[PDB]
Amino acid sequence: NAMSVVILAAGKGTRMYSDLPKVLHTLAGKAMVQHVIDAANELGAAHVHLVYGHGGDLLKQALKDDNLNWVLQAEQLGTGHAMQQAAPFFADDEDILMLYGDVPLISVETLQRLRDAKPQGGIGLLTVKLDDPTGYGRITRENGKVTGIVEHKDATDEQRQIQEINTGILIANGADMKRWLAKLTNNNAQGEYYITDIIALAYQEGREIVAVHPQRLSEVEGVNNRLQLSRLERVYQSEQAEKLLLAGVMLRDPARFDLRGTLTHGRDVEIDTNVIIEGNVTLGHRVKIGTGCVIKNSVIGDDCEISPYTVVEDANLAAACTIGPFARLRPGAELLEGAHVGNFVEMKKARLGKGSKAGHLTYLGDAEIGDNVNIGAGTITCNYDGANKFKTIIGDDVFVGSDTQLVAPVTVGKGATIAAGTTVTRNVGENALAISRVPQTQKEGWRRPV
Amino acid sequence: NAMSVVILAAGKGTRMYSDLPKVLHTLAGKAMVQHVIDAANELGAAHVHLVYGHGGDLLKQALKDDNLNWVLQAEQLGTGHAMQQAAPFFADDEDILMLYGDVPLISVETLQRLRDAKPQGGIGLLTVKLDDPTGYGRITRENGKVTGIVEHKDATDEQRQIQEINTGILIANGADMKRWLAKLTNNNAQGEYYITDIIALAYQEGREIVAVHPQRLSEVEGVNNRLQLSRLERVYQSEQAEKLLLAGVMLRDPARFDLRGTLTHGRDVEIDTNVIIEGNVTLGHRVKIGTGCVIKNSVIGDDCEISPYTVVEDANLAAACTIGPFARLRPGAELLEGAHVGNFVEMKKARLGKGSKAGHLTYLGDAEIGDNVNIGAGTITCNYDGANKFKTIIGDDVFVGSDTQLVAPVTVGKGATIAAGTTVTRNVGENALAISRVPQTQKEGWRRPV
Amino acid sequence: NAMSVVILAAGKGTRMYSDLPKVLHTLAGKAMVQHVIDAANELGAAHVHLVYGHGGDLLKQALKDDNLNWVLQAEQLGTGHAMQQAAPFFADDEDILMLYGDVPLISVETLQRLRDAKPQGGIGLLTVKLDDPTGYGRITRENGKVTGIVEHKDATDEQRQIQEINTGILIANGADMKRWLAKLTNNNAQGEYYITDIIALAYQEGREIVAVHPQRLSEVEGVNNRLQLSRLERVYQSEQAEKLLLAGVMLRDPARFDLRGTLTHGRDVEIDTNVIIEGNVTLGHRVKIGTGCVIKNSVIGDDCEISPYTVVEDANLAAACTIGPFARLRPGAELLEGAHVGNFVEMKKARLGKGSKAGHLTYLGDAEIGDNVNIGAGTITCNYDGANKFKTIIGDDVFVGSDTQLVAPVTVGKGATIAAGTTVTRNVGENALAISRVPQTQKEGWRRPV
Ligand SMILES: CC(C)(COP(=O)(O)OP(=O)(O)OC[C@H]1O[C@@H](n2cnc3c(N)ncnc32)[C@H](O)[C@@H]1OP(=O)(O)O)[C@@H](O)C(=O)NCCC(=O)NCCS
Ligand SMILES: CC(C)(COP(=O)(O)OP(=O)(O)OC[C@H]1O[C@@H](n2cnc3c(N)ncnc32)[C@H](O)[C@@H]1OP(=O)(O)O)[C@@H](O)C(=O)NCCC(=O)NCCS
Ligand SMILES: CC(C)(COP(=O)(O)OP(=O)(O)OC[C@H]1O[C@@H](n2cnc3c(N)ncnc32)[C@H](O)[C@@H]1OP(=O)(O)O)[C@@H](O)C(=O)NCCC(=O)NCCS
Ligand SMILES: CC(=O)N[C@H]1[C@@H](OP(=O)(O)OP(=O)(O)OC[C@H]2O[C@@H](n3ccc(=O)[nH]c3=O)[C@H](O)[C@@H]2O)O[C@H](CO)[C@@H](O)[C@@H]1O
Ligand SMILES: CC(=O)N[C@H]1[C@@H](OP(=O)(O)OP(=O)(O)OC[C@H]2O[C@@H](n3ccc(=O)[nH]c3=O)[C@H](O)[C@@H]2O)O[C@H](CO)[C@@H](O)[C@@H]1O
Ligand SMILES: CC(=O)N[C@H]1[C@@H](OP(=O)(O)OP(=O)(O)OC[C@H]2O[C@@H](n3ccc(=O)[nH]c3=O)[C@H](O)[C@@H]2O)O[C@H](CO)[C@@H](O)[C@@H]1O
Ligand SMILES: N[C@H]1[C@@H](OP(=O)(O)O)O[C@H](CO)[C@@H](O)[C@@H]1O
Ligand SMILES: N[C@H]1[C@@H](OP(=O)(O)O)O[C@H](CO)[C@@H](O)[C@@H]1O
Ligand SMILES: N[C@H]1[C@@H](OP(=O)(O)O)O[C@H](CO)[C@@H](O)[C@@H]1O
Ligand SMILES: [Co+2]
Ligand SMILES: [Mg+2]
């Protein structure tokens, strides 16, 4: 059956105290409304209608899904009114599923169950039972059948005793939807147009409304302030962490792990406390990640060991590499098999070859370093002249003495040796020793200042 | 109505296993007793009487509140006895509020409610209902009115069934207080002087005792050991975190955030996991703080981005600065607008000008660096000669080559360039190139040691 | 009474998705089965029989306890069958206690209570009452006495109502054990040999079976997947943290503390958030450890302060040392009294003397540095020539200027001074100034590249 989704996101997020529209606030590194859009497409949505009232410029900048139909609702006259703005775009022969832009954890599995419960010519309604139903629409039933929804403000004390409430999510045929929407009136407690009135309108026509319930309450929780957002962030992180544990990834403390993107992994991966994974990350077999690491958009091969407090972004590590602790890999950093980066070392657009080592206090930027190379502590590639960037090339089997500065562009031939403290401004020949040293001298009986 | 506060803090903290008096142990970076003193002053206390038995030297070193009246209780003969030591200092026409020095979370709002419930000539009592009231004073009532308190040890099995217990906090007129205290006797189960006996003494006189309850149990929890302290630390951090979230500050994980002082902030501030804020910190609008940062007594302007694992103390950052990851700012560090500090960079009593950059492996101490300056990786200001410290001055538009040592005192004129690997011992002229380099030479067929 | 322990660990750990046998997966830095072995020896076990089915090579590599008797069970025909494989090794006059290799938190205190409850000629059984007993053996009783165990699969709906279940742990005389085991048959729902059938076999003989219960459920929880493992890891860390707090160690956040080995400590030690302790660590009095530190197999003297994000392994710090933040001490690092290591400093097989300082951007490897020495920022000991390592010796009262490279082997005499930017290749005399500097020159009107 064909189906499109409508996302109401035109309400004002006042308790957020933000200059950024509420639905753009992120959860696990992704806009709340993007989570909803993803669920809609993942369910099979042909078109996704997004109803907004303001922040349109920022929304269009953040959202780029091709099948997004932007629907304006200049005045927020109620959920019913918002749906009327989008209704003209509904197809007469497709189901229309309504979702909220600020209820990010809704699962496709529950939406699928809701789709299957919807009867021909009727309506699928998602309801939930709460201990305290205060503030939400009450589900009314006659002989076990759903007959309508009464909003909290409009409900009597007795009706307020009803604990089964409307989550807001529902699905119904597009043509039927348009028929009911045209009949909405605003003669109620809030003087708004209630999308909820279509339930009674359908029942009166003899149509059937069936209700299904979410798997978890967190699935239909809405966000109006940052505290509520932080709680859903934890729920999301906890569920993702448990899935990873069940899939064979060892997290030393699942409450101290954050995944903000996608994680691909092999077997026996171990991840210590406080690690953060961002963007798309691929980990090979037996990768070990020490505490506090941050890994973003990077590829890590089999058997790599990432020591504590190492930050990595857009890097590629071959098998058996060891980096950190306190290493900092920036975009373009590449390590070939068995390479090693130690503490207080930074790499940017730089490749380190097989079995090569940069153990300490070093900066490698815009460089190509061969295999079996040893980079002494304190070595620095001077890749910038104040306007342009230049490349440093170091061949295989090179030994670079400590505190050497390589002024790019420059090439050091294979097998060369560079003396400690050297400033390299010209190419170094193969198997040669490069040096630029003042012989050590001494002054006797030197007395330091008082 | 005039009011003074008395804080009993003379009990022995044996289960703390410490050489530091129990009430001096900190919670959120502040002494437990200081939290109580703050609540007393915040309530409007004219005088704060502090009753202590030992550790007086350390207490006087830690506490400096001007309105503190030190009251000695050499022998701990009971709360009643402690109050008798302070009683002579009570004014006949003021209310006297009694608090414990080891119950740090008591809220001014609850104390205010207690003050308002206190009847003329009577007593305001703070009581709470517990599932297991074992160990605490039982509140006795006659026709709904409080008539006394019976200590656990003195109470019969039936009275021990009473679940409403004494939190210990109470308030009453000073003159009345002195009248009852003089009548205390130690003929009871513990052979001590019970401050709790004044409740029955007042009731017998025809005075009225009214009870009020705390908003939260944590508010009246006392600390006798480190475990109990750690629990109140979490409660405190959790409540502060939720307030910040409700005020518009985004905390990526409120359970992994610690504030130990005061935090001032603009809008849309984002704070990642494991950040610690100490002393007084001011954050502008849109400040983003990455994971694990520690910020103490510092000012951070609008739009700054503090990358992961950066430590800052007594620093001042103008708008749009970017620092870290792995940057270390010490007292006196100042960055002007748009300045940048990268990884493994340390600054102390050093100013970096507008749009200036110190991207890596650098130490800047006792320096003034102008605008649009580029500090190459590995640069070091040698500000110390073994006894004295000297200043390094670098004008605008200066380019400092990598691994340059600036031996202070020295001045580098505007527009100058310093060659990589230079040792700068003398002033450099404007628009000039400073250099101290040995030309690179080479020895063919060099064979490294076997 | 003499007693040996048998540990069943031959079951397949399928839901672990690992190439490492399930019982070898670690909890608090120690193999799950090692925790069980430790409990067995700690209880007084004369011999520990370990029944395994595969991964024998890896198991033998990990476990080395001298009193381990390896027992093979090639086919997993049931717990009864596994016990028959070990039974021949049981002594007729010793008690035999059965434990599971994947139930790591079993406490010696509970096992001791179980040993004391075991009646002469009978059986001690460890049982627990669960809300949902689904999946476990049901304890059957006649007039209050345990008469047998019925496995879930074999139990009727009514018997499945029984909530008291078998934890699996039991103890009985070796000779009796062998008598019952020989009678096991596999005519039951799973077609396996149930060790649980010995309960009914003993009762029929007129022997008495007494049941005792664990102190905590976590004590008898078994691990089949990583999620269950992570939960027991938290339970373990939480209990260890609370013990440390009760013993006088201040943990700023007990939920953000991990101990993976042994921690020895003095009084008033303070440990901030996210610290990880590994191997055997000894802390003196008043040691303060800042956030995120990792300390492994090291000794820390009285009054040391370890600043944030410092990593330490196999190091020895005397009293009053201060290191970090961002310091990295590797094996062999030694600091004498009052020594100081600052940020972005690394030490390996290097000793720093009393009151000596290495404040920044430095690497000290294979060195002996005297007292009252000052190591300038950027100093590096070049201890490696590509095949051999050499020692650097620096006497007392030496001042090493910034960015100095010491090419080992070399000795700097007491009282010497080394100029900033020096490359030291030869010994430096006492009280002498060593230097290898090119005088600073200048080129006027230098224009940087466009
Ligand atoms: C250059 C270096 C390799 C020489 O070590 P070495 O051979 O044991 O030292 P030597 O005293 O024998 O000097 C070797 C040569 O350098 C020459 N030399 C010394 N000072 C010189 C200078 N200023 N210019 C040119 N040559 C110089 C000598 O004349 C000699 O030549 P020769 O062998 O033909 O006779 C060494 O000083 C060095 O810089 N090592 C690197 C250490 C390092 O940083 N390692 C990384 C691990 S932390
Ligand atoms: C000094 C430096 C700027 C010169 O680069 P360059 O102009 O392209 O190099 P050149 O080969 O043309 O040498 C330039 C001048 O230096 C002079 N020179 C070379 N060695 C010299 C020495 N020991 N003493 C004095 N002058 C020297 C040349 O004679 C020449 O003079 P000229 O232009 O009047 O003919 C460059 O080597 C340098 O140190 N760059 C800094 C890189 C850096 O650390 N960047 C930070 C980003 S990571
Ligand atoms: C070497 C150093 C100590 C000299 O400082 P200074 O005495 O104030 O400087 P001066 O101008 O007086 O030079 C002192 C001597 O060095 C000599 N000198 C200068 N350049 C020289 C060279 N290339 N070779 C040999 N001697 C040289 C001078 O001739 C002079 O000798 P004299 O005193 O007999 O007349 C200083 O430049 C230095 O390197 N300080 C270390 C700073 C540091 O890194 N501190 C750590 C804290 S961050
Ligand atoms: C009349 C109606 O629908 N009532 C339901 C609505 O309450 P209620 O209408 O009170 O809910 P909200 O005001 O929070 O709005 C719901 C969603 O609709 C959006 N929105 C709202 C009004 C508008 O004019 N434009 C718009 O886009 C909001 O941005 C939000 O995403 O949701 C509750 C669950 O949360 C249900 O129990 C109520 O039965
Ligand atoms: C007789 C009395 O008061 N009983 C109350 C007291 O119990 P109790 O007297 O047992 O309480 P504690 O011994 O903990 O002492 C209470 C407070 O008084 C201080 N202190 C105590 C004795 C002394 O001689 N000097 C002194 O300064 C302690 O340091 C602590 O701050 O508090 C309980 C709540 O915690 C109440 O339910 C009890 O009804
Ligand atoms: C017949 C029997 O014993 N049933 C008990 C067993 O269930 P059950 O037999 O189902 O338990 P498991 O299959 O998990 O095995 C128990 C332990 O024995 C080991 N093992 C099992 C079979 C084998 O052939 N070899 C072997 O070494 C496993 O590795 C594990 O350490 O433990 C439950 C508690 O967890 C008890 O409530 C059940 O009454
Ligand atoms: N300084 C050298 C030393 O490191 P360290 O002595 O710190 O271990 O040996 C390493 C290989 O064993 C080399 O790559 C390093 O350049
Ligand atoms: N090394 C230079 C380079 O950094 P990097 O190449 O690491 O990005 O460019 C920066 C500005 O773009 C300069 O301030 C740095 O001195
Ligand atoms: N650079 C020096 C300075 O450090 P800093 O100025 O950063 O405090 O003084 C210290 C002692 O007071 C010395 O050990 C450092 O070598
Ligand atoms: Co140098
Ligand atoms: Mg250097």
CA distance C450 to chain B (A): 14
Q: Of B224, B256, B290, which marks where a domain is finished?
A: B224
Nearest to A436 by CA among A428, A445, A444: A428
Residues of B in contact with A431 (CB under 8 A): 444-447
Backbone angles phi, psi at B230, to 5 degrees: -55, -35
Q: Is cis: bond before A308, omega within 30 of 0?
A: no
CA distance A196 to chain B (A): 30
CB interface of B with A, residues 348-407, below 8 Å: 360-361, 374, 376-378, 385-388, 399, 401-403
Nearest to B250 by CA among B237, B241, B238: B241
Interface contact flag, A248 C17, Cβ < 8 Å = yes
Of the residues B305, B404, B446, B450, the best mutation for testing chain A's interface (the one with the most A CB atoms within 10 Å of its CB) is B446
Q: Which residues contact B199 (CB under 8 A, 6 or more apart)?
A: B123, B125, B146, B147, B148, B149, B170, B209
B445·A431 Cβ contact <8 A: yes
From chain B, the residues in CB contact with C346 under 8 A are none
The CA-based diameter of chain C, rounded to the nearest angstrom, is 109
Q: Is A102 annotated as a binding residue?
A: yes
- A partners (3+ CB pairs within 8 A) are B, C
Determine, for residues C435 and A442 on separate chains, whether the beta-carbon distance falls below 8 Å. yes
| CA pair distance B292, C338, nearest whole angstrom | 28
| A-chain residue closest to B403, CA distance | A405
Per residue in A400-409, is it b (16+ CB within 10 Å) or e — as a string?
bbbbbbbbbe
As a residue count, chain A comes to: 450
- The CA distance from A264 to the nearest CA of chain C, in Å, is 15
- C276 and C216 share a domain? no
Residues A237, A327 share a domain = yes
CB burial class (10 A; 0-12, 13-18, 19+) of residue C343?
buried
Q: Out of B242, B291, B441, name the one closest to residue A227 (CB).
A: B242
* Residue A291 and residue A274 in contact, taking contact as beta carbons nearer than 8 Å: yes
Question: Is there a single domain that holds both residue A149 and residue A281?
Answer: no
What residue type is assigned to position C178 of the chain?
K
Say what angle helices B174-181 and B197-204 make with each other, to 10 degrees.
110
Give contacts of C253 with chain B, Cβ < 8 Å: 230, 233-234, 237, 258
Residue A306 to residue B407: CA distance in whole angstroms: 38
- Is residue B99 left, alpha or beta, with left meaning phi > 0 and alpha meaning psi from -120 to 50? beta
Same domain for A220 and A235, yes or no, is: no
Mutate to test the pocket of ligand 3, among B330, B364, B381, B407 (most ligand atoms within 8 A of CB): B407
C-alpha B340/C-alpha B323 separation (Å) is: 6
Interface of B with A in 129-188 (CB under 8 A): none
Q: Is A85 within 8 Å of A199 (Cβ atoms)? A: no
- Cα separation, C74 vs C72, in Å, equals 6
C216 and C229, same domain (yes or no):
no
Question: Which residue has the CA at smallest separation from atom 3 of ligand 7?
Answer: C384
Contact A252 C230 (CB under 8 A): yes
Q: Which structure tokens are listed for C326?
A: 């961002």
Residue A296, token pair as written in the block: 């973003």
Beta bridge partners of C352: C335, C369
Q: At residue B387, what is the residue type?
A: A
Q: Nearest to residue B260, comparing CAs of B234, B280, B246?
A: B280
Contact B440 A448 (CB under 8 A): no
CATH of the domain at C258: 2.160.10.10
Q: Token pair 């009345």 is at which residue?
A: B176
Closest listed residue to residue C387, CA positions, set A394, A399, A432: A399
Q: Copy the structure tokens of residue B413.
A: 């004129």
Only one residue has tokens 């950052």, namely: B317
> What is the C-alpha separation between A283 and A279, in angstroms, rounded?
13
Strands (E), B156-231: 164-173, 209-212
- If we measure between CA atoms, which residue out of C366, C392, C360 comes closest to residue C379? C360
Method: X-ray
Mark whether A162 and A273 lie in a shared domain. no
- Annotated binding-site members of B for UDP-N-acetyl-alpha-D-glucosamine: 8-11, 22, 73, 78-79, 100-102, 137, 151, 166, 224, 330, 348, 363, 374
Grouping H, G, I as helix, E, B as strand and the rest as coil, residue A154 is helix
Tokens of C356: 């000596």
Asked if residue C243 has its Cβ within 6 Å of ligand 3, the reply is no
The answer to whether the beta carbons of residues B186 and B180 sit under 8 Å apart is no
Q: Give the H/E segment covering residue A124.
A: strand A123-129
The whole domain housing B253 covers: 225-450
How far, in Å, from the CA of B342 to the mean position of ligand 8? 10
Nearest CA in chain A to C421: A421
Distance A170 CA to ligand 10 centre (A): 69
**Residues of C designated as active site:** 360
**Does C283 lie in the same domain as C151?**
no
Residues A328 and A209 occupy one common structural domain: no
Measured in angstroms, the CA of C178 and the nearest CA of chain A are apart by 39
Residues A273 and A154 in one domain: no
Name the closest residue on chain C to residue A401, using Cα atoms.
Answer: C382
Give B68's strand partners: B48
Q: How far is residue A39's CA from residue A105's CA, in Å, rounded to a whole number?
A: 9
Contacts of C95 (CB under 8 A, 6+ apart): C1, C2, C3, C4, C115, C118, C171, C172, C173, C174
Q: Name the packing angle between helices A32-43 and A108-117 (round to 10°).
A: 50
For ligand 11, the distance from its centroid to the CA atom of residue A403, given in whole angstroms, is 5
For residue B408, what is the nearest residue in chain C, using CA coordinates?
C420
Is there a single domain that holds both residue A211 and residue A254?
A: no
Q: Of the candidates A361, A444, A446, which has its C-beta nearest C363's C-beta? A: A361
Residues A124, A199 contacting (CB under 8 angstroms)? no
Please report which helix (H) or strand (E) contains residue B399, including its range. Answer: strand B399-400
What ligand 7 atom has the least distance to the C-alpha of C366?
A: 6
Q: Across the interface, do C402 and B403 touch by the CB < 8 Å criterion?
A: no
Residue B90 and residue B177 in contact, taking contact as beta carbons nearer than 8 Å: yes
Report the SS3 class of residue A58: helix
- Strand positions, DSSP E, B116-242: 123-129, 138-142, 145-150, 164-173, 209-212
Contact A294, A275 (CB under 8 A): yes
Together in a domain, B148 and B254: no
Nearest to C258 by CA among B234, A291, A245: A291
Q: Do B226 and C446 touch (CB under 8 A)?
A: no
Of all residues in chain C, the one with the smallest CA distance to A385 is C449
Our CA angle for B158, B164, B166, nearest 5°, is 110
H/E element, C6:
strand C3-8
Task: Out of C254, C376, C439, name the one closest to residue B436 (CB).
Answer: C439
Q: Residues lining ligand 2, CB < 6 A?
A: A 382-385, 407, 425; B 376-377, 401-402, 419-420, 435, 437, 439; C 441
Q: Pairing relation of β-strands C26-27 and C30-31?
A: antiparallel
Cα B196 from Cα B140, distance rounded (Å)? 12
- Catalytic residue numbers of A read 360
Query: Number of folded domains in chain C?
Result: 2
The four Cα atoms A349, A352, A357, A359 give a dihedral, to 10 degrees, of: 10
Do B243 and B108 lie in a common domain?
no
To which H or E segment does residue A241 belong? Answer: helix A226-246
Instruction: Compute, in angstroms, the gap from residue A376 CA to the centroid of ligand 7.
Output: 8
Residues of C in contact with A255 (CB under 8 A): 234, 255
What phi and psi, each to the nearest 5 degrees, are found at residue A161? -80, -20
Q: Closest approach of chain A CAs to the CA of C321, in angstroms?
A: 22
C18·A248 Cβ contact <8 A: yes
B contacts of C420 (beta carbons < 8 Å): 380, 382, 405, 407, 423
Residue type, A282: T
Task: Give C438's DSSP letter.
Answer: P
CATH code, B99: 3.90.550.10
Cα–Cα dist B202/B172, whole Å: 10
Resolution in A: 2.2
**Does C101 count as an annotated binding residue?**
yes
**Which of C22, C79, C193 to mutate to test ligand 6, by most ligand atoms within 8 A of the CB atom?**
C79
Last residue of a domain, one of C163, C190, C224: C224
On whether the CB atoms of residues A17 and B269 are closer than 8 A, the answer is no
Which residues of A are less than 8 Å from B374 in CB distance?
A: 384, 386
Partner-chain residue, chosen from A25, A229, A432, that has the shortest CB–CB distance to B442: A432
Q: Which atom of ligand 8 is nearest to the CA of B357?
A: 14
Nearest-Cα residue of chain B relative to residue A343 = B344
Q: Is the CB of C222 under 6 A from ligand 6?
A: yes
Q: Single out the residue in B224, B255, B277 at which a domain terminates.
A: B224
